[PDB]
């Protein structure tokens, strides 16, 4: 049970461990330690850009054929994605299901997609 | 709160039970299907 500097974007784990000391007199402090919960991490991330639950688009413009299939950065077993052409739109969207048990096909690109883990010990 | 696979538990009723193997509650549903108009008639008139 010791105080944590929490100066690293990845060394903080557990909103319960963060409380936030108060102030006696002065002015309202900056949005670094006065915020409660884990919302301060999220607001810092949106302030800088490095974010969790990122809404940034994937390689939609890329064809993602067998030469270089698209990547998915998520450890979850299932996949909920789609790919129906390199441009913004050329046909009705059909979902793609990358998996390791079997292979996948696009029916317009014919791409075999490979799910992409994150490195583990 | 996150232990529902979603195959047979989505229904807001319990399949298990020897006294009610979906036989007593559903017979009550049968009864209440025609219960309200019958009692509405019975309050003021006869059926």
């Amino acid at each position: 049970p010791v105080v944590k500097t929490a100066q690293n974007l990845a060394e903080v784990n557990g909103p319960e461990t963060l409380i936030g000391p108060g102030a006696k007199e002065g002015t309202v402090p900056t949005d670094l330690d006065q915020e409660t919960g884990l919302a301060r991490l999220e607001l810092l991330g949106k302030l800088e850009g490095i974010d969790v639950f990122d809404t940034k688009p994937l390689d939609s413009s890329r064809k993602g054929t067998m030469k270089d299939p698209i990547i998915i950065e998520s450890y979850d077993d299932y996949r909920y994605v789609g790919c129906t052409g390199s441009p913004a739109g050329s046909h009705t969207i059909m979902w793609l299901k990358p998996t390791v048990n079997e292979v996948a096909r696009c029916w317009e690109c014919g791409s075999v997609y490979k799910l992409n883990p994150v490195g583990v010990p | 709160v996150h232990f529902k696979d979603g195959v047979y538990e989505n229904i807001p009723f319990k399949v298990k039970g020897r006294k009610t193997p979906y036989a007593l509650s559903h017979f009550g549903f049968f009864a209440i299907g025609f219960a309200v108009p019958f009692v509405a008639c019975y309050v003021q008139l006869k059926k």
């Binding site: 319960e16 | 019975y42 008139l45 006869k46």
Partner: protein, 59 residues
């Protein structure tokens, strides 16, 4: 303060339902909101019990 930390530690070391927050309020409300609720609900539909038994028969 000197009690928020203790309460948080107690909750962390003992996870129980009802939040262990309002025991006296619960005892004042729930048994009352049962007994008095019955006492205020039942007579309204028990007054016509004597009148109950209408077969819609007239002579």
């Amino acid at each position: 303060a000197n009690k928020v930390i203790q309460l948080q530690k107690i909750f962390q070391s003992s996870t129980k339902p009802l939040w262990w927050r309002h025991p006296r309020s619960a005892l004042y409300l729930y048994p009352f909101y049962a007994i008095f609720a019955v006492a205020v609900v039942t007579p309204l539909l028990y007054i016509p019990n004597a009148i109950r038994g209408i077969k819609a028969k007239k002579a």
